[PDB]
């Protein structure tokens, strides 16, 4: 029992649950858009978003990674490192 993933679908689901969140906009919601650069939201709220990622996908990401995600592209890249779905 193991349905394999896809790159586009996991990007869509990450951007989906980001768009569910409050203090950002659905207007300019880019995968290639950082957090401290243009959005200005908190590092505290950044790790809240990290926790939302983990509670969707059911595994920890460690602390030395947790400093250095900062954007949804590297989020999708690191969960693609974990689950390793590269057809």
């Amino acid at each position: 029992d193991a349905p394999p993933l896809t790159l586009e679908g996991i990007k869509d689901r990450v951007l989906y649950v980001l768009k569910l969140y409050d203090k950002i906009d659905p207007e300019k919601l880019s995968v290639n858009s950082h957090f401290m650069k243009d959005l200005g939201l908190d590092s505290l709220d950044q790790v809240e978003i990290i926790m939302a990622m983990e509670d969707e996908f059911g595994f920890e990401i460690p602390d030395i990674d947790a400093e250095k995600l900062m954007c949804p592209q590297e989020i999708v890249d690191y969960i693609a490192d974990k689950k390793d779905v590269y057809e």
Binding site: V47, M51, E60
Partner: protein, 176 residues
């Protein structure tokens, strides 16, 4: 206790405390709605005396926070079924056969699998060809005599693959 640096940060210590407190609060609180309530309560508790610019008072109240947190820990946390100490923890290690093997098959089994073995052979030639001169020129010239980090710069200038790539790229899938 980290690969790149030596000390975390003050803020990184506070951040790890926040993540572990949020995790232990998950494990304490069922039904998810009062959990969202108490999570906003703890977010406000960090909002109480966040923005001070002291050092000694900051680390002192952080110590007292650690004391009242080690009191307020849940004893059997809901760790995910991939965590160390969890439920899987290399659950499928039975089929995590390493990739240095499989050369010692009988060649009848190589006649069974022609295409994968020929492509692994050209991977191996790619491994051996781009190995000594450039990669070891980087790893013998480009750092200081003290390395002072566990990272490595890529093959950033001209040519081949970034150094020491083999047993990190060529690894099992972690899920057969």
């Amino acid at each position: 206790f980290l690969p790149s640096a030596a000390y975390l940060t003050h803020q990184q210590k506070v951040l790890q405390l926040y993540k572990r407190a949020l995790r232990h609060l998950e494990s304490r609180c069922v039904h998810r709605d009062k959990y969202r309530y108490f999570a906003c309560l703890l977010r406000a508790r960090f909002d109480e005396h966040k923005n001070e610019k002291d050092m000694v008072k900051a680390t002192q109240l952080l110590r007292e926070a650690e004391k009242e947190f080690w009191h307020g820990q849940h004893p059997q946390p809901y760790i995910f079924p991939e965590s160390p100490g969890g439920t899987s923890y290399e659950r499928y290690e039975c089929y995590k056969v390493p990739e240095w093997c499989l050369d010692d098959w009988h060649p009848s089994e190589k006649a069974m699998y022609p295409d994968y073995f020929a492509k692994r052979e050209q991977w191996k030639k790619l491994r051996r060809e781009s190995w000594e001169r450039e990669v070891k020129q980087l790893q013998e010239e480009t750092p200081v005599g003290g390395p002072r980090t566990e990272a490595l710069p890529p093959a950033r200038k001209q040519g081949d693959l970034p150094p020491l790539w083999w047993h990190i790229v060529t690894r099992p899938r972690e899920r057969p």
